[PDB]
Amino acid sequence: SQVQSGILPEHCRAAIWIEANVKGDVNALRECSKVFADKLAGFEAQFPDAHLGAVVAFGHDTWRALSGGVGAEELKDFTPYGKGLAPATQYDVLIHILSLRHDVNFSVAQAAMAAFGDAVEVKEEIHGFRWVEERDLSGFVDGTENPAGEETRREVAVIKDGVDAGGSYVFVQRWEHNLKQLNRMSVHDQEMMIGRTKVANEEIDGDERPETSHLTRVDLKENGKGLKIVRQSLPYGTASGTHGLYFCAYCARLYNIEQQLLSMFGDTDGKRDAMLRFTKPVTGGYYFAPSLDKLLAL
Amino acid sequence: SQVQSGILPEHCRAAIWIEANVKGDVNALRECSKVFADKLAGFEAQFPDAHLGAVVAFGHDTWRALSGGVGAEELKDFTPYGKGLAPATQYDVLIHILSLRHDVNFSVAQAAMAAFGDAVEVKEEIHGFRWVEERDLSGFVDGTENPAGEETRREVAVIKDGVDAGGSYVFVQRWEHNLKQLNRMSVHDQEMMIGRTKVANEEIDGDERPETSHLTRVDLKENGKGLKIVRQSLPYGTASGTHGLYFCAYCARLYNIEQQLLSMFGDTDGKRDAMLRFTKPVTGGYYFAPSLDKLLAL
Numbered sequence: 001s002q003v004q005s006g007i008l009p010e011h012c013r014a015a016i017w018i019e020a021n022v023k024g025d026v027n028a029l030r031e032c033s034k035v036f037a038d039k040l041a042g043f044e045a046q047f048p049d050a051h052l053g054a055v056v057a058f059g060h061d062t063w064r065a066l067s068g069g070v071g072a073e074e075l076k077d078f079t080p081y082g083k084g085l086a087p088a089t090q091y092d093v094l095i096h097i098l099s100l101r102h103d104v105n106f107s108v109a110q111a112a113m114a115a116f117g118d119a120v121e122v123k124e125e126i127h128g129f130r131w132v133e134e135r136d137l138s139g140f141v142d143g144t145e146n147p148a149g150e151e152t153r154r155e156v157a158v159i160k161d162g163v164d165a166g167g168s169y170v171f172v173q174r175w176e177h178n179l180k181q182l183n184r185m186s187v188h189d190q191e192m193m194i195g196r197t198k199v200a201n202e203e204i205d206g207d208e209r210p211e212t213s214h215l216t217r218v219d220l221k222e223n224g225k226g227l228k229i230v231r232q233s234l235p236y237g238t239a240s241g242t243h244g245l246y247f248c249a250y251c252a253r254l255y256n257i258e259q260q261l262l263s264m265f266g267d268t269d270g271k272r273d274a275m276l277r278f279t280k281p282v283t284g285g286y287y288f289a290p291s292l293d294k295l296l297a298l
Numbered sequence: 299s300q301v302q303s304g305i306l307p308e309h310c311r312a313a314i315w316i317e318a319n320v321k322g323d324v325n326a327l328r329e330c331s332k333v334f335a336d337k338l339a340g341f342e343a344q345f346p347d348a349h350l351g352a353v354v355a356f357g358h359d360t361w362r363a364l365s366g367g368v369g370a371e372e373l374k375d376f377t378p379y380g381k382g383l384a385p386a387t388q389y390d391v392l393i394h395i396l397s398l399r400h401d402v403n404f405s406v407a408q409a410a411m412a413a414f415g416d417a418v419e420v421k422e423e424i425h426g427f428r429w430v431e432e433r434d435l436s437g438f439v440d441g442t443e444n445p446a447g448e449e450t451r452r453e454v455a456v457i458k459d460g461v462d463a464g465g466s467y468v469f470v471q472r473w474e475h476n477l478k479q480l481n482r483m484s485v486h487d488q489e490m491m492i493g494r495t496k497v498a499n500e501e502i503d504g505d506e507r508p509e510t511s512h513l514t515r516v517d518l519k520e521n522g523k524g525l526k527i528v529r530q531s532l533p534y535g536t537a538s539g540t541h542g543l544y545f546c547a548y549c550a551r552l553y554n555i556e557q558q559l560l561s562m563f564g565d566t567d568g569k570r571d572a573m574l575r576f577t578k579p580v581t582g583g584y585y586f587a588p589s590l591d592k593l594l595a596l
């Protein structure tokens with residue numbers, strides 16, 4: 001059972017995320033996904049230069065109908081966390097395209113619109129870009145402790161056996177940064193908000209940083225082992241308008257993601273992530289990405 | 299006199315254009331431009347291999363004020379052409395940033411906003427990207443006959459002497475492509491529309507292509523010599539929403555640009571550019587880019 005090509009590649013330079021709702025018969029998606037998968041393989045062969053991959057994933061209601069209610073038992077509609085502090089915008093279809101080349105990405109995105117256009121209504125399209133030194137627009141490096149290498153990323157993100165082998169759970173959440181509020185903070189204040197030093201990007205030990213620090217919020221364990229995720233987030237936006245981080249995570253279990261959300265947004269222990277001092281999520285949804293084999297034969 | 303670094307570089311991968319109006323006192327721009335140019339010089343040293351360049355240019359009324367009526371006598375407000383076919387959105391300040399790296403462009407743009415933000419209200423920010431094979435989103439190679447090499451480009455784009463030595467005239471015009479309308483045309487018909495063959499990008503002899511063809515519209519001569527411009531246009535937009543070409547031209551004389559506009563939009567001989575079958579301009583403005591010396595010396 002083959003994984004879809006966009007989950008495992010590391011250090012993309014650019015990505016496109018399309019979120020869309022079914023219009024009409026959900027069953028049309030079966031043929032759309034096969035058409036797009038074929039176009040995608042063609043682009044991957046045409047531009048090996050790009051290290052291109054993509055993922056098609058589906059929301060609870062849509063996947064339940066496409067799978068006939070079999071498998072993906074964890075999948076559910078994203079609903080608001082923190083009593084609304086993390087809003088919900090659950091759509092039916094997620095397409096995630098990533099590579100080293102924005103120009104190739106755009107061609108693949110056009111192919112996706114051609115494949116799905118008559119079956120969906122697009123609600124969001126975000127073009128992510130890797131920024132200097134792989135930093136978030138806040139000036140902090142983003143990705144350091146992400147799982148590295150195919151073996152470890154596969155362990156964290158790709159379902160290993162069962163009816164869903166080769167699939168993955170996906171979470172996407174667009175954040176809007178208020179950089180003027182960030183810059184009112186001393187660098188020490190910022191570093192206590194994140195849990196790592198800003199320029200040097202060294203971790204502050206768990207006892208030196210407040211329990212509201214981001215790293216304390218998301219360093220969660222079960223049975224003494226950390227709940228890991230594979231993050232494909234990138235910056236997005238304009239300099240003069242809206243900008244921030246398009247957050248994107250893959251995980252073999254929805255649980256690891258949900259537990260970090262419950263932690264960050266006050267649900268678990270009443271404390272909230274200190275990053276909410278300067279940035280806020282404005283979308284959110286859960287999706288199931290089937291194995292490529294399952295995607296090809298819906 | 300030194301030219302601003304953004305005019306002459308060839309084959310940028312990505313650009314950012316910012317159009318803005320003055321908010322308070324126009325004289326605040328004097329310190330804003332010096333601050334930004336200082337910041338730009340720092341990014342050009344920090345990223346010596348990115349081919350980074352930027353241009354600050356000014357609308358008619360804002361330049362008259364900043365320069366005490368001195369020079370830039372050609373500079374005027376952009377006004378509609380073709381009885382409204384080409385609308386006018388003349389603003390006060392144009393900032394154009396280009397390089398091989400979008401991530402570096404975004405840093406420069408943030409610096410532009412840190413420097414001009416208090417003094418202006420941004421009307422538009424557009425991120426351009428070079429597409430596959432340097433093709434416009436219509437599928438036609440864009441740029442083939444552009445002036446190449448620093449000598450020829452300086453002849454065309456940089457003012458040679460006089461009070462304005464080192465400066466240039468800029469025209470920006472965002473177009474919205476309707477690729478559905480494009481793809482209803484046969485390839486032959488598209489080629490007759492542009493004036494070059496589509497895949498091979500070979501010229502079609504002027505006698506074998508309609509006088510409404512783009513090339514016939516824009517390949518103009520005065521006194522037996524071609525009216526050249528230096529184009530920096532790039533594709534922009536999203537696959538599912540608005541997309542097209544952000545047109546951008548530099549010229550030593552406003553006359554070369556205006557003559558092509560008069561031709562394309564039916565004002566010269568009543569014939570209109572055949573590209574209007576599928577795309578349309580929705581903005582337009584004229585700006586004056588002073589040499590880098592005046593920009594620091596305002």
Ligand code: HEM
Nearest residue numbers: 136138140141142143144145146175218245247260261279
């Ligand atoms: C629901 C949203 C998010 C989740 C679930 C999440 C999850 C994580 C995880 C699991 C880590 C690695 C922690 C470790 O084991 O060391 C991490 C690190 C980090 N995150 Fe978040 N993150 C989220 C949102 C954000 C946002 C919005 C930003 C910035 C604006 C951000 C910036 C960072 C930074 C700078 C690091 C440290 C560098 C790294 O290890 O990647 N995160 N995040």
Ligand code: HEM
Nearest residue numbers: 434438439440441442443444473516517543545558559577
């Ligand atoms: C939707 C907007 C436009 C598109 C898709 C477009 C596309 C093209 C293409 C495909 C070429 C031939 C390849 C090349 O030599 O670059 C070309 C040439 C050219 N274009 Fe455009 N163009 C657009 C707008 C404009 C405008 C508004 C102007 C001038 C005001 C202009 C001026 C020129 C010039 C001067 C040439 C070179 C002609 C020659 O000497 O062969 N273009 N354009």
